[PDB]
């Protein structure tokens, strides 16, 4: 049993809810919240900007030190950093950004990072301002992630479309 509430069960391991990942993280304090990161960990907008704003910019300060030491992530890659006030850990995952021309096949590699964690609160990778089709992102998530993932979908209209169209 875990603390996640109000989710619709899609599969054995994937759950979905219309919720802001920031408000959900604040309520649950999950072991792992996933950030929709870019390779530079520049948390300007979308999930990354809202998460970072909720940490009072502490996520960005930590991220800048990580990049200064390690250099940029790979598209499809990830790193584990602090969850600050939102979670124990933040798994920063880089899905391909279609609005930068990145290979959508890298979305499966991105979701494979989730398998290193038993339970996660996450957004749909490469959705929103990353430009991918969220229906596609949910299909790759279900077909790739084997650990227990609780997906937060901010947009109520999109949530309803994801549920209604789910095979
Ligand atoms: C998905 C879930 N929660 C969010 N909060 C801000 C953006 C976003 C996207």
């Amino acid at each position: 049993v875990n603390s996640f509430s109000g989710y619709l069960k899609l599969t054995d391991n994937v759950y979905i809810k219309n919720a802001d990942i920031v408000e959900e993280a604040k309520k649950v304090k999950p072991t792992v919240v996933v950030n929709a990161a870019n390779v530079y960990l520049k948390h300007g907008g979308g999930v990354a900007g809202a998460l970072n704003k909720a940490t009072n910019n502490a996520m960005q300060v930590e991220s800048d030190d990580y990049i200064a030491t390690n250099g940029p992530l790979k598209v499809g890659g990830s790193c584990v950093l602090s969850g600050h006030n939102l979670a124990k850990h933040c798994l920063h995952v880089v899905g391909p950004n279609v609005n930068k021309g990145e290979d959508i096949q890298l979305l499966k590699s991105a979701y494979e990072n989730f398998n290193q964690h038993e339970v996660l609160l996450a957004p749909l990778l490469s959705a929103g301002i990353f430009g991918a089709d969220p229906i596609h992102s949910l299909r790759v998530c279900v077909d790739t992630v084997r650990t227990n993932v609780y997906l937060a979908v901010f947009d109520k209209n999109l949530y309803d479309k994801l549920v209604s169209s789910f095979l």
Side-chain angles (χ1 to χ4, degrees), residues 1-26 28-166:
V1 172
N2 67 51
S3 159
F4 288 106
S5 181
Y7 287 73
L8 175 69
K9 181 172 183 56
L10 295 174
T11 70
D12 181 58
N13 66 297
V14 178
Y15 295 79
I16 195 164
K17 184 184 178 177
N18 175 217
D20 177 353
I21 200 173
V22 172
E23 287 311 311
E24 193 75 4
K26 282 201 287 192
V28 175
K29 290 290 237 87
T31 305
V32 180
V33 65
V34 174
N35 182 32
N38 60 51
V39 294
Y40 306 109
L41 301 179
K42 285 172 52 90
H43 309 304
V47 166
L51 292 169
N52 175 60
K53 179 179 178 186
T55 76
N56 181 44
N57 211 50
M59 178 180 283
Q60 190 64 67
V61 170
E62 179 195 32
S63 292
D64 291 346
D65 170 86
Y66 173 88
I67 296 289
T69 299
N70 300 108
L73 299 176
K74 299 171 181 181
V75 178
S78 71
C79 69
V80 180
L81 291 172
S82 180
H84 300 279
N85 54 316
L86 303 179
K88 185 174 201 284
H89 304 287
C90 181
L91 181 71
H92 294 273
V93 180
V94 186
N97 189 327
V98 176
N99 304 317
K100 302 179 174 169
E102 296 167 352
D103 169 18
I104 195 58
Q105 300 305 140
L106 288 169
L107 186 54
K108 188 171 182 77
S109 302
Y111 274 115
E112 288 171 341
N113 297 286
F114 290 23
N115 290 320
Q116 299 295 316
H117 302 278
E118 287 191 353
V119 183
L120 314 87
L121 171 62
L124 287 166
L125 298 181
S126 297
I129 69 175
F130 281 62
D133 176 3
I135 294 170
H136 176 66
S137 183
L138 179 55
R139 181 30 62 189
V140 178
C141 179
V142 159
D143 293 345
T144 306
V145 180
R146 297 178 300 284
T147 57
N148 294 322
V149 57
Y150 289 86
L151 294 169
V153 178
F154 184 56
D155 193 271
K156 170 59 166 154
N157 183 296
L158 172 59
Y159 171 82
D160 285 349
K161 182 171 139 132
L162 285 168
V163 168
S164 288
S165 57
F166 183 69

